[PDB]
Write an enzyme that holds these catalytic residues in place. Structure first.
Site, PDB file in Angstrom:
ATOM      1  N   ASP B  53       0.838  -1.189   0.000  1.00 29.08           N
ATOM      2  CA  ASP B  53       0.000   0.000   0.000  1.00 29.08           C
ATOM      3  C   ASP B  53       0.878   1.245   0.000  1.00 29.08           C
ATOM      4  O   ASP B  53       1.820   1.353   0.789  1.00 29.08           O
ATOM      5  CB  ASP B  53      -0.928  -0.004   1.214  1.00 29.08           C
ATOM      6  CG  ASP B  53      -2.280   0.623   0.921  1.00 29.08           C
ATOM      7  OD1 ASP B  53      -2.757   0.503  -0.226  1.00 29.08           O
ATOM      8  OD2 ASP B  53      -2.869   1.231   1.840  1.00 29.08           O
ATOM      9  N   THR B  86      -4.066   4.814  -3.566  1.00 35.00           N
ATOM     10  CA  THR B  86      -3.122   5.651  -2.837  1.00 35.00           C
ATOM     11  C   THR B  86      -1.724   5.637  -3.442  1.00 35.00           C
ATOM     12  O   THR B  86      -0.892   6.459  -3.046  1.00 35.00           O
ATOM     13  CB  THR B  86      -3.056   5.219  -1.372  1.00 35.00           C
ATOM     14  OG1 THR B  86      -2.217   6.123  -0.645  1.00 35.00           O
ATOM     15  CG2 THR B  86      -2.501   3.816  -1.254  1.00 35.00           C
ATOM     16  N   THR B  87      -1.440   4.725  -4.371  1.00 36.40           N
ATOM     17  CA  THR B  87      -0.212   4.781  -5.154  1.00 36.40           C
ATOM     18  C   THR B  87      -0.403   5.572  -6.440  1.00 36.40           C
ATOM     19  O   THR B  87       0.465   6.366  -6.823  1.00 36.40           O
ATOM     20  CB  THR B  87       0.265   3.372  -5.509  1.00 36.40           C
ATOM     21  OG1 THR B  87       0.534   2.650  -4.303  1.00 36.40           O
ATOM     22  CG2 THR B  87       1.529   3.423  -6.331  1.00 36.40           C
ATOM     23  N   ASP B 387      -8.243  -2.829   2.227  1.00 37.03           N
ATOM     24  CA  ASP B 387      -8.353  -2.193   0.916  1.00 37.03           C
ATOM     25  C   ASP B 387      -9.602  -2.659   0.177  1.00 37.03           C
ATOM     26  O   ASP B 387     -10.313  -1.848  -0.431  1.00 37.03           O
ATOM     27  CB  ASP B 387      -7.104  -2.480   0.086  1.00 37.03           C
ATOM     28  CG  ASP B 387      -6.026  -1.434   0.277  1.00 37.03           C
ATOM     29  OD1 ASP B 387      -6.173  -0.582   1.176  1.00 37.03           O
ATOM     30  OD2 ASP B 387      -5.030  -1.465  -0.476  1.00 37.03           O
TER      31      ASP B 387
END
Ligand code: ADP
Ligand code: ADP
Ligand code: MG
Ligand code: MG
Lengths: 49, 518, 40, 121
Positions: B53, B86-87, B387
């Site tokens: 993550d 989130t990346t 997630d």
């Protein structure tokens, strides 16, 4: 292989940009306008004023 | 002809910020998509983590540049809002900052770039909305598809067949799928215990305790009557100063007998209500359980669970339908929780776990227990489950579903380049740069999978130019194909939040012109 | 030699658990692509 | 470039380092395997000496710093807890197949494919 050719074109064409920036004018617009002038009328002796 | 702008420190600071952002983006570029492999972070103390993550990778990694810190805050904000991407949001922000560095070099004021980026984002949100298709609940197939897509880029991908259906069942067993408009992840208790393998993860509709049974004589209860206790089963003591004075030899016998009788009275009132398993709140300043009290409870054939955290009372009440008591006079069976079974299970020598299952009262709460060989895989598995839960939360929030595998952002790049071609002025270059800085995601997906990035991106652009929308990278085929038929989809909220958050934080970064040490 | 003749037997639990645990530990340690060692 | 104030090892370097750590642990535990294996002697700093053969005790008594080897030590401890016998076997198997997988990866085979292959196998 055309990507490298276009990168070469832009890299050698930065010289008018630096010339105009040192002259105080806006580089990108002046360079685009003089390039358009060079391609419209076949007068390859148009440079940064 | 024009302003000299003698000060050059603002330009240096802007280029430093752009370079730092680009470096941070490139650091995690290789941790994107199914073929991206996770990072390993070990902090100052000898503690390690195997994280994929982006929010966790960026938080654990103690950065030092202000642009990097703003990027990590962006990543955590995107995780809070959506929970996936989130990346990709960090990659987008860094990539289009690296795009705008040459705009700065071309003699463009930062305000023009910021406004043009805002306009490009405005167009892109509409592009994404048009590209989407409606999604509606009770369609378990598309929910499973979204969960598997969310879990594909994690270590638990091979377990996704036995881990995504329970992941979506957890959400579907908490909130009503008719009128929800939001879900809560607080009432999804993820309990982790070491031992076993991942294929031993379980979803329980009841309640899970890590506490231990005090009386080691009773282990299982059928038709359990659970009752929470908030007072103390010990010798009486008032809030203000307590003192007993003894002046005769009979007084010792009297005080001992009276204390025993008081404890026995309390235990008898507890037992006469039919309560067969007791839950004592973790109390301090007064012994929650006395040895004599525990002896009496064991004598009347009861199961006692003590040392229960204060913050868990709400969770227990919402799970098993019991109501807490703070006075013995209000302990009645009319407000006593009930369950089909209470068990204490030894986990093959790895731990002792308490299960309250079959609660007759309705329970709007489920619990996931995750198993793994070592602790690192357990942490990554619970993060991956979180997630997937956040993805389902996104689906519940707004009902809009788009394709993945590079298709949305490459279609956005095409549409936004075509929009920039009709925006003559100083903002045409800026919109074009914004459009061509969102091809970083398909390029990264191509190069992380071992594919040829140039040809893959070019063929993707060609395919989307002909209107063959929802066409993207496929790593099973090893090429470019329709993604919807390959069952890879994601909610629209993730993409829209990523794009909007990245654009806003990039405008904020562009507004900076100086850094000073305080 | 035929182990049945000599009697060398082990419960299948040892083999099954060893194989599963070893392969899972290898999977967990093999996902590593890079390492960031933070200074104390 | 990055402002992290640490050390960064990327690519083949860290993969080879992890494989070397696993192989070092396997080589420590390997000589104590089989009916012909001869047990080891573990002596502490202050002189508290012990003589042992089981892998779990050897690995627990050893002081390990590299996390890629701490994983194997915890694997041996877990195998000891869940079963009891076969503690050296699990470490040997894990390290050997990790080495084989790294050998596969060196030829530019994506590690996701080798992970799926091991999982199915
Ligand atoms: N099976 C798949 N095939 C192709 N692309 C995928 C697949 N699974 C995920 N992706 C893509 O990988 C990208 C990254 O997703 P992921 O790594 O799971 O979370 P994050 O978006 O937080 O990095 C997503 O944009 C998605 O489109
Ligand atoms: N009498 C025997 N004949 C052949 N093989 C044996 C005999 N005794 C043990 N072995 C083999 O030698 C190995 C010894 O394993 P061992 O090191 O004792 O297990 P652990 O790692 O739990 O200590 C076992 O795998 C077993 O198959
Ligand atoms: Mg994802
Ligand atoms: Mg043995």
């Amino acid at each position: 292989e055309q990507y490298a050719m276009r990168a070469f074109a832009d890299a050698l064409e930065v010289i008018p940009m630096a010339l105009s920036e040192n002259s105080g004018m806006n580089p990108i617009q002046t360079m685009t306008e003089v390039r358009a002038r060079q391609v419209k009328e076949m007068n390859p002796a148009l440079g940064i004023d | 002809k024009g302003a000299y702008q003698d000060r050059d420190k603002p330009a240096q600071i802007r280029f430093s910020n752009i370079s730092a952002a680009k470096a941070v983006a490139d650091a995690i570029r290789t941790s994107l998509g199914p073929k991206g492999m996770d990072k390993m972070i070990q902090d100052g103390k000898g503690d390690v983590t195997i994280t994929n993550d982006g929010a966790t990778i960026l938080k654990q990694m103690q950065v030092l540049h202000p642009a990097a810190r703003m990027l990590v805050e962006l990543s955590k904000a995107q995780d809070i809002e959506a929970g996936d991407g989130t990346t990709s949001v960090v990659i987008i922000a860094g990539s289009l900052l690296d795009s705008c560095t040459k705009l700065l070099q071309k003699g463009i004021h930062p305000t023009i770039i910021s406004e043009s980026f805002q306009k490009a984002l405005e167009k892109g949100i509409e592009i994404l909305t048009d590209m989407s298709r409606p999604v509606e609940l009770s369609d378990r197939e598309t929910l499973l598809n979204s969960a598997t897509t969310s879990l594909n880029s994690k270590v638990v991908s091979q377990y996704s067949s036995l881990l995504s259906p329970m992941s979506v069942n957890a959400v579907m067993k908490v909130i009503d799928p008719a009128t929800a408009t939001s879900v809560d992840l607080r009432d999804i208790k993820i309990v982790k215990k070491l031992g076993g393998t991942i294929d031993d993860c379980e979803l329980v509709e009841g309640l899970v305790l890590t506490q231990k049974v005090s009386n080691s004589g009773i282990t299982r209860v059928e038709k359990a009557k659970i009752g929470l206790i908030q007072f103390c089963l010990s010798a009486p003591k008032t809030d203000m100063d307590n003192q007993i004075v003894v002046s005769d030899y009979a007084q010792m016998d009297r005080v001992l007998r009276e204390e025993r009788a008081y404890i026995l009275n309390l235990v008898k009132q507890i037992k006469k209500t039919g309560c067969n398993v007791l839950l004592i709140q973790k109390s301090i300043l007064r012994d929650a359980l006395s040895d004599l009290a525990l002896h009496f409870l064991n004598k009347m054939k009861i199961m006692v669970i003590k040392d229960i955290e204060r913050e868990d009372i709400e969770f227990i009440c919402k799970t098993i339908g019991t109501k807490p008591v703070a006075h013995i006079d209000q302990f009645t069976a009319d407000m006593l929780g009930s369950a089909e079974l209470a068990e204490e299970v030894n986990l093959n020598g790895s731990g002792k776990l308490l299960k309250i299952t079959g609660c007759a009262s309705p329970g709007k709460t489920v619990t996931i227990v995750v198993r793994g060989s070592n602790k690192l895989v357990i942490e990554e598995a619970e993060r991956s489950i979180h997630d997937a839960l956040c993805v389902i939360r996104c689906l519940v929030k707004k009902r809009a579903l788009i394709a993945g595998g590079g298709a949305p952002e490459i279609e956005l790049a095409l549409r936004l380049t075509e929009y920039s071609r009709t925006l003559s002025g100083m903002e045409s270059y800026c919109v074009r740069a914004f459009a061509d800085a969102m091809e970083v995601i398909p390029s990264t997906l191509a190069e992380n999978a071992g594919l040829n990035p140039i040809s893959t991106v070019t063929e993707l652009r060609n395919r989307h130019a002909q209107g063959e929308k929802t066409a993207g990278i496929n790593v099973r085929k090893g090429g470019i194909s329709n993604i919807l038929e390959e069952l890879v989809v994601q909610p629209l909220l993730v993409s829209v939040s990523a794009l909007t958050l990245a654009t806003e934080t990039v405008r904020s970064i562009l507004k900076i012109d100086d850094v000073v040490n305080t | 030699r035929d182990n049945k003749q000599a009697g060398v037997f082990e419960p299948t639990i040892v083999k099954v658990k060893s194989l599963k645990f070893a392969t899972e530990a290898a999977i967990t340690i093999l996902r590593i692509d890079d390492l960031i060692k933070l200074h104390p | 470039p990055l402002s992290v104030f640490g050390d960064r090892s990327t690519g083949e370097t860290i993969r080879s380092q992890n494989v070397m750590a696993a192989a070092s642990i396997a080589n420590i535990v390997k000589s104590s395997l089989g009916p012909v294996g001869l047990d080891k002697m573990l002596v502490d700093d202050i002189g508290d000496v012990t003589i042992t053969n089981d892998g779990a005790t050897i690995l627990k008594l050893l002081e390990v710093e590299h996390p890629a080897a701490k994983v194997l030590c915890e694997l041996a401890d877990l195998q000891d807890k869940e079963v009891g016998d076969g503690t050296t076997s699990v470490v040997i198997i894990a390290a050997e197949l990790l080495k084989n997988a790294d050998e596969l990866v060196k030829q530019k085979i994506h590690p996701t494919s080798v992970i799926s292959g091991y999982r199915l196998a």
